[PDB]
Amino acid sequence: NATNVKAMKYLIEHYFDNFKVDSIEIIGSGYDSVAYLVNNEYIFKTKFSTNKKKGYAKEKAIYNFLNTNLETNVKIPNIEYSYISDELSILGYKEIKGTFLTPEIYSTMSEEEQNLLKRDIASFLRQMHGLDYTDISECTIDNKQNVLEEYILLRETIYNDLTDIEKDYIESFMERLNATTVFEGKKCLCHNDFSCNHLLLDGNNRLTGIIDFGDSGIIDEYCDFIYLLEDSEEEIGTNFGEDILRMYGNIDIEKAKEYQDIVEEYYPIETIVYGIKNIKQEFIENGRKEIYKRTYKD
Numbered sequence: 694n695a696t697n698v699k700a701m702k703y704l705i706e707h708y709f710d711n712f713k714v715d716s717i718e719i720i721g722s723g724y725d726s727v728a729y730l731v732n733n734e735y736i737f738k739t740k741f742s743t744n745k746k747k748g749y750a751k752e753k754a755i756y757n758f759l760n761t762n763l764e765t766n767v768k769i770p771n772i773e774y775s776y777i778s779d780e781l782s783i784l785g786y787k788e789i790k791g792t793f794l795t796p797e798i799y800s801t802m803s804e805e806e807q808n809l810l811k812r813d814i815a816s817f818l819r820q821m822h823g824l825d826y827t828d829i830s831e832c833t834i835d836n837k838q839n840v841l842e843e844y845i846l847l848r849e850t851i852y853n854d855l856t857d858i859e860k861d862y863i864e865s866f867m868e869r870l871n872a873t874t875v876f877e878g879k880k881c882l883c884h885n886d887f888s889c890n891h892l893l894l895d896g897n898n899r900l901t902g903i904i905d906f907g908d909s910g911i912i913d914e915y916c917d918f919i920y921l922l923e924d925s926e927e928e929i930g931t932n933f934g935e936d937i938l939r940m941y942g943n944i945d946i947e948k949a950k951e952y953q954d955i956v957e958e959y960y961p962i963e964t965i966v967y968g969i970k971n972i973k974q975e976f977i978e979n980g981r982k983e984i985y986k987r988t989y990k991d
């Protein structure tokens with residue numbers, strides 16, 4: 694453990710001239726990134742060269758757009774330090790304080806407390822989705838088209854070596870993609886990774902902050918409800934998402950649910966594609982195995 698922290702302490706002090714690191718610890722990890730808590734006050738997100746070459750550049754541009762344009766009391770990262778290169782990216786901002794929302798915490802809240810949290814979420818999403826996004830228009834994301842391009846990459850690489858069961862799962866997904874209408878609705882600026890591990894509560898169990906706008910862009914409005922609708926151990930549950938949708942208003946709930954169900958079906962394929970793009974066999978195997986689990990569940 695000691696070694697990572699030392700290298701990262703060195704890089705921070707090297708790229709940010711007057712910054713002194715008095716303490717540093719690992720606070721989180723993705724597959725190709727690490728986050729550190731520094732001086733018990735700053736979050737530094739860091740990444741070495743990955744397949745997404747403009748990754749922390751976009752995230753920084755989004756925080757800068759949002760800190761200029763959002764009217765909200767909910768806090769989000771405000772970037773004070775940034776170093777962006779092909780081989781290394783670092784973003785630093787003052788840590789937003791609070792407690793991450795979990796299913797367990799939610800279940801100890803009174804009905805009224807739950808309602809106020811749902812209302813806070815709806816209001817935040819309303820305010821973000823209603824922004825004029827002209828000034829961030831470079832951050833457009835077309836999920837259908839992205840899926841079609843990932844399918845082409847499969848066909849060019851490993852598709853012919855898959856099993857019939859794997860091929861059928863993929864083709865059956867592509868048929869559903871082609872018949873659906875859920876990519877044809879309102880587009881807006883979405884957080885696009887809006888799960889409860891990115892939502893911070895204050896001491897009264899009200900929403901106080903939101904982190905990780907790394908995947909944000911102009912995309913289907915239904916995107917920000919994918920995790921709120923999700924039934925799993927990590928998320929609160931379908932009822933929670935449904936109530937938030939009703940409070941948010943002027944959105945077709947059945948379509949939001951169809952969008953979530955399609956994204957969920959895609960997950961194993963998305964996992965396979967990640968493995969191909971990043972040359973990680975482990976992800977290709979995991980996604981293929983998950984196809985079998987889903988096929989045999991019923």
Ligand SMILES: Nc1nc2c(ncn2[C@@H]2O[C@H](COP(=O)(O)OP(=O)(O)NP(=O)(O)O)[C@@H](O)[C@H]2O)c(=O)[nH]1
Binds near residue numbers: 789
């Ligand atoms: N309390 C607190 N924790 C934070 C804050 N920013 C980041 N974290 C912590 O650091 C973890 C990683 O941050 P996050 O932005 O989600 O990055 P990531 O998802 O690991 N990486 P990437 O966004 O590049 O895929 C979060 O799960 C959380 O533990 C913050 O402002 N406050």
Ligand SMILES: [Cl-]
Binds near residue numbers: 974977978981
């Ligand atoms: Cl494999």
Ligand SMILES: [Mg+2]
Binds near residue numbers: 891905
């Ligand atoms: Mg995250």
Ligand SMILES: [Mg+2]
Binds near residue numbers: 905
């Ligand atoms: Mg992220």
